[PDB]
Curated annotation (Swiss-Prot), chains A, B:
Residues 551-818 form the PI3K/PI4K catalytic domain. Candidate target in therapy for inflammatory diseases. Selective inhibitors and protein ablation are anti-inflammatory in multiple disease models such as asthma, rheumatoid arthritis, allergy, systemic lupus erythematosus, airway inflammation, lung injury and pancreatitis. Gene3D superfamilies: 3.10.20.770, C2 domain, Phosphatidylinositol 3-/4-kinase, catalytic domain, Phosphatidylinositol 3-kinase Catalytic Subunit, Chain A, domain 4, Phosphatidylinositol 3-kinase, accessory domain (PIK). ATP binds at residues 583-592, 618-626, 710-718. This is Phosphatidylinositol 4,5-bisphosphate 3-kinase catalytic subunit gamma isoform. Pfam families: PI3_PI4_kinase (PF00454), PI3K_C2 (PF00792), PI3K_rbd (PF00794), PI3Ka (PF00613), PIK3CG_ABD (PF19710). GO terms for molecular function: 1-phosphatidylinositol-3-kinase activity; 1-phosphatidylinositol-4,5-bisphosphate 3-kinase activity; 1-phosphatidylinositol-4-phosphate 3-kinase activity; ATP binding; ephrin receptor binding; identical protein binding; protein kinase activity; protein serine kinase activity. Activated by both the alpha and the beta-gamma G proteins following stimulation of G protein-coupled receptors (GPCRs). Activation by GPCRs is assisted by the regulatory subunits (PIK3R5 or PIK3R6) leading to the translocation from the cytosol to the plasma membrane and to kinase activation. Inhibited by AS-604850 and AS-605240. Keywords: Angiogenesis, ATP-binding, Cell membrane, Chemotaxis, Cytoplasm, Disease variant, Endocytosis, Immunity, Inflammatory response, Kinase, Lipid metabolism, Membrane, Nucleotide-binding, Phosphoprotein, Serine/threonine-protein kinase, Transferase. Residues 557-563 are annotated as: G-loop. It is linked to Immunodeficiency 97 with autoinflammation: An autosomal recessive disorder with variable features. Affected individuals have childhood-onset antibody defects, cytopenias, and T lymphocytic pneumonitis and colitis. Some patients may have features of hemophagocytic lymphohistiocytosis. The gene is PIK3CG. CDD domains: C2_PI3K_class_I_gamma, PI3Ka_I, PI3Kc_IB_gamma. It comes from Homo sapiens.
Amino acid sequence: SEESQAFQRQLTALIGYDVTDVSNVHDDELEFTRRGLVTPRMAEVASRDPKLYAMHPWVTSKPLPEYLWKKIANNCIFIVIHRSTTSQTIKVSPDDTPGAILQSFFTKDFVLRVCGRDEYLVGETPIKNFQWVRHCLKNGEEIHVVLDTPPDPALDEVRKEVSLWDCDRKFRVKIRGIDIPVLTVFVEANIQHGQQVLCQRRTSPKPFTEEVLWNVWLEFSIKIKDLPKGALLNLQIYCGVQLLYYVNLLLIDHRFLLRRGEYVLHMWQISGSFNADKLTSATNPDKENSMSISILLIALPKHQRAEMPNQLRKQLEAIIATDPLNPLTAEDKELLWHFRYESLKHPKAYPKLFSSVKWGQQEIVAKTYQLLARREVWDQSALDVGLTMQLLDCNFSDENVRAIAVQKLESLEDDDVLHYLLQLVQAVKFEPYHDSALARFLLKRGLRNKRIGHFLFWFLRSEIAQSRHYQQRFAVILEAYLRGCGTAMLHDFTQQVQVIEMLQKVTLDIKSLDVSSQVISQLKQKLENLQNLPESFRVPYDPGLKAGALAIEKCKVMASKKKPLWLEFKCADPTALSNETIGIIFKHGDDLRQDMLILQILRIMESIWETESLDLCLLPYGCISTGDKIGMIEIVKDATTIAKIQQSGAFKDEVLNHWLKEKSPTEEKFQAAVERFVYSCAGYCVATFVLGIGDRHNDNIMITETGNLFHIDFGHILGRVPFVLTPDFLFVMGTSGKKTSPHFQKFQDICVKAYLALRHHTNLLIILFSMMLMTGMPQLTSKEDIEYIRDALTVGKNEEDAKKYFLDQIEVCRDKGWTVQFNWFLHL
Amino acid sequence: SEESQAFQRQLTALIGYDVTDVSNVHDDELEFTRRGLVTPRMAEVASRDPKLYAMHPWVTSKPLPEYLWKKIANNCIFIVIHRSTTSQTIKVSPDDTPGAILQSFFTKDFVLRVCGRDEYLVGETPIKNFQWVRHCLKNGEEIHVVLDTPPDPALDEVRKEVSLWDCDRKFRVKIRGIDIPVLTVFVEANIQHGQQVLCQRRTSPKPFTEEVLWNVWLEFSIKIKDLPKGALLNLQIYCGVQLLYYVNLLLIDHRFLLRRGEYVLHMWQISGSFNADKLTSATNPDKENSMSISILLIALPKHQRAEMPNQLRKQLEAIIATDPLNPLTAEDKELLWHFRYESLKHPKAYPKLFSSVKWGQQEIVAKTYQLLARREVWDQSALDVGLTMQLLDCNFSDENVRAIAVQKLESLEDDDVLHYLLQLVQAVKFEPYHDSALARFLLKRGLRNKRIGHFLFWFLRSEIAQSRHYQQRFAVILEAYLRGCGTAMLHDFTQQVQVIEMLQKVTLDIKSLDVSSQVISQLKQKLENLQNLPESFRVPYDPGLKAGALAIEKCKVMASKKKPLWLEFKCADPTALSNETIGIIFKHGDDLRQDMLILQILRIMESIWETESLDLCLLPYGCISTGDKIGMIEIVKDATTIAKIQQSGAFKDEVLNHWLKEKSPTEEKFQAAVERFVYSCAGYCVATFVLGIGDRHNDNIMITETGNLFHIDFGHILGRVPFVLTPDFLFVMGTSGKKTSPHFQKFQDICVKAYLALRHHTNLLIILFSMMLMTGMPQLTSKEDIEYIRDALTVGKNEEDAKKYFLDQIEVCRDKGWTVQFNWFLHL
Ligand SMILES: COc1ncc(-c2ccc3nccc(-c4ccnnc4)c3c2)cc1NS(=O)(=O)c1ccc(F)cc1F
Ligand SMILES: COc1ncc(-c2ccc3nccc(-c4ccnnc4)c3c2)cc1NS(=O)(=O)c1ccc(F)cc1F
């Protein structure tokens, strides 16, 4: 067709990559996946509710936090409904539905929409179970909604559309040669399966030149029939010993066919590390410069007790109780496997049990499938996200194992998927094949809910624009989502990408030119030209918010070396309750993906703290990676850095407390800010400690006028003191040197409650941390790196040792005063 | 009948107890056993060869020892056949049969009989495989046989002849009271099974008087259906804590009936010890004085894999490799039981595996029987006597387990049964029931071979006359044997018992009267009266030898406090090659049973040494226990004590070497005596060390004129230096203080070869030692007692540490010289 052309081109433009381009594939897997994904797409689209999809209510089934209760006077919540010019304040009960609310208003068709936002309070859900309502309560804000007409669902219209088990020969592969357009070397051939090296063979070392031939058959010890679905041929080049290049080939393809024939693979260049890029089946796109290797190489079929000696059960339980990062000895595996049927009665033994499987033996793999067939304890088990995540990491290449993980994820409510979306999108990198159950799950949940969909779009598009290793795979999944999300979101994404693309250019043109008066007249000039750009666009980190017109006079070039744009937008929603502008930092030169991850962990940390009636007042500002080393960041209102305050490398102790009094008009407020400070401070001390990012210079720590403390720029320290608890912070709590005070004792108490809380989720955090390092920090992918968090969470320790451990830390910060901040200033 | 009367009375007179007397039984088990034993008796009698039974060839299938080879010149052995007055020396080949020999003699009906002995060289056996022939060779004696006529087999004529598994109630027993014709006390009720206490209940303590009543029901935790065949109700009385009396009752009888009703049991008096008397089901016969207990109390039915984790197989093998006296932890048992089918592939795991059985659970016991049903590795296994003995000790009460032990014993040749007869007879004490497979086995093997039979008679009769705990059981078995052994042996036993009974009296009458001239005229007088006594009788420790007339002039009263008779007899066989008299010590006042055991171990030690081409020249003189604290001992010819030599408490170093020169007429002989001394010395050092009986006073060590050293009186030290290696012994080897010599180096070498040899039979010796202490040393029955031999045999050590261990010992003896012998003299 012709309209399909100017539509596939639109898709490409949103995606940022051409899913038709076949200049870099050695098979048809990507294409097959495009087709395969049609069914799940159409299934979800066809069975989605029109009205609920249009309005996308943001709700939760969780209980209302205790601290959120202590803010409700006599089971009454006031809801101010605005019609056109007027407004009526109403008594509502937390337990009643919006439907009810409306009928109790007509006494003194339509649907309640949050004022100045694309957020609807609608559906058969208690007003208390709406996130927006919980947000207002938390901040002590007033709940304002307008009486508008339901969005026309027609705007969400979707456009019209020999057996392997018989070959007993040893596997072998011929290494022809290696070529590079521009020391001795050898090629190493590994047959891997989920980080496990099944078998390995090397070549003879040969003088390294622009072309090295071998023409040798490498015969492995593994029989062709013992090859597992998902096994990689891992080709690596060493020089003399150090790894220079690598590349991977799936030995069994997406149709269960053994791999056969001639291959010239373009390899990746290197910069025992656990980097997820090392696993990719994709070949390097840069054919011109890249090193390449030449190799020369039946379908896989499908599958269809004495009481334990007490001491063995003790040993088994001991093992199952260890942490995810706890290494299994061959003795442990032999035991887990020998007693596999007992192990299966424990959902928590699963990650370790399937790590005890000899995937290199077709008979063992078969018995394993027989295990998963007696899947009743697992299927009936209460969803455990940390446990489910462990089955989705780099240590599992089997699609049935990984599939029972995704199966458990289906019970997640939209609110929880949002909590784990980013890390789930990242976990797609550990999938052997492009079309996996995990991928389909992401796709289905994005199509079912606009909010998840919106972030799915930016998480994918973020990876596609800066990950050559995985962009092809991600681009296909993004396409499947764009073809089912609907006409209105398409138009919205189109608008958002256009705006960002325009703001990118300006950022680049301003950069190539400290902050002079000329560079300022050029920022203002370029902005004036652009504004003369969509009349409105959604904010990617806060999609309910629509930004509109620029406030050029408030725009500027910040004073860092990266010359970030500080932008200010008017809210395009007239029904907005304020004139406060939307503040967006636009930054080029950094890979903001790592920040997104840290911030997202912080959000997960807060929910853990909520399940324990705790609110450490963190501030995970919005941060979205939009392209190659560019992105945008939420400007937190009324905020100033701790360094700028002191600046008013000398440091004063009272200066901070002074600054709060100044900004608090009354005493009730100063005291409430001094509380906020104590909570937000403890929140960031505990958080940063766990994530090993506490030792920051105070230039990187900020504070709101209402006393809310919060760290910033988490990529900088990922690119001694356990955390920043400096005198000025302590002074606010009212303490000097060897002393104590009503707040300091409070602060000490919140920490230990925060700390011990997190430790109740050791495994979930260990897995999330491990995965964060393998998919976002190609630099921080060492064994000793990952195992930092085990120490920081005092694994194995009881709550007394742990408590006394953290307190010792808090002391280290005091005994060291300004010593570390002072060094941090010294410019050597 | 009437002839049966004067024949049952004869049996009683041989037995030394009336198997008809029912004045001491609470059931009919003994009687039932008398009847039960008829079949095995008649089976063996009916199927025994007349001629071979009459002549009882003493043969062996073992190879001729290497040292026995080096005594055969050019495959020729000379055999001097005597007819009447003449004699012909003949060339014979070691490999040819006696049948052959005869045909090679008529050239230059009948049967060859050793001169002056009831010993025949007959049958289809190589002349080399006759023990007599091996004896002559060993001693360098000349083989003299006479051509006599075959013994008439007619002389061997034999005279003409609710279910338990349904009762689910807890077992209980009522303790009425305790009575004694002549502090507080209580009764303790144990349900035991093979030294294992299944369940235990006590009474309330009550003031100890001549009659104490309780009238209380003791309810145990064990269900009636879980009671194992062979379980004992073990009633014990404690005073305040110390055990005073005990008695046992089989809870399930010989017909598989549960025990029911009223019992008054007469209990045994005491003198955590492992005494075999404590296990007896017999009641005390001394009704007049003995303490007794009153108690008040359905038939037992009959019965009809993932590879091991390497580490578990390692652990299992580790366990199975330990020694018999090595204690199993509950962890070990749980493992052996969990992996019972693997354990069954190892005959050596058997003792430990059946010690890992919960006999107190009818379901476990049942599975165990299912194990023994897959008895193929065991049944095909090469006979291991030590292993078979472990299944017959105090730790096994189950008749099926114990029965597979006796089954393995059937493959023993007569020569080997003789080696183990004594300890097998003792092991009958560990049998729960009177009619056991072990008992039948003994009976069958005694009836099949006259020599075994002869010793069977004296071993039984020894126990019957000094063991009230087991005499009833033993007396029944003896009766079964006497009714099938034949008319000639009956007459012989009759003769032997008469002689001994006469010699006993004289010993008693002489005792009640140092050595005066009057007591001498009274010994001679009493002997003169007796001789005016069978004209001939067999020597119980050497049955082939027939003693006849006394040599009164050589008779005397030895100079010990026990006033033993030193007797001298003429050999009643005219065809004897000498005029040397038979020398027999007749001793009253000692329990000679312990000696018999030690000596018998020494004999077992020599056979072990033979299987390793070694001959340490021990001298296990004959010693038979004939009655209550009486017995007889072989006088070793041309022998004098080491003390009497020195006496010629001062000690001289050369005196011993001097004594040898004196007695050796030539130099060739002195040198051959100095060799004999070095071997016999090392033999006794190693032996005594292992049995913890080395530290003897030299009054208890003797030497033959041909240099053969040998210890005596082994009951004395069972009633510091590791062994007697005194200067005088070392001088003979040619050494003084810090020195060495051709012999000393030799002696050191033989020891280590002797020692390491025995260690190859650690288990066999440990079991034999353990059993020797539990059936013969009521005094030496402690845990630390039994486990002495583990240390002396350096269990677990390799042959280097062991070798260097023994050498250190040999040194201890030198560094201490006469120090210990000197103290041994000091009369404090
Ligand atoms: C990705 O790294 C970042 N992470 C976070 C932020 C960030 C986020 C939210 C905010 N809300 C309010 C105010 C500010 C603000 C304004 C002016 N001065 N300071 C902070 C603010 C900054 C910026 C960056 N990048 S950055 O702007 O170059 C930069 C880097 C390091 C540094 F210490 C300072 C920086 F300004
Ligand atoms: C059961 O205890 C024994 N074990 C063994 C023998 C025994 C055995 C064989 C023999 N062959 C030849 C010569 C003698 C012999 C003659 C004279 N003097 N000494 C030994 C000899 C002794 C005796 C006893 N009992 S004993 O005769 O009372 C006795 C006890 C301790 C003691 F040192 C001395 C004793 F003479």
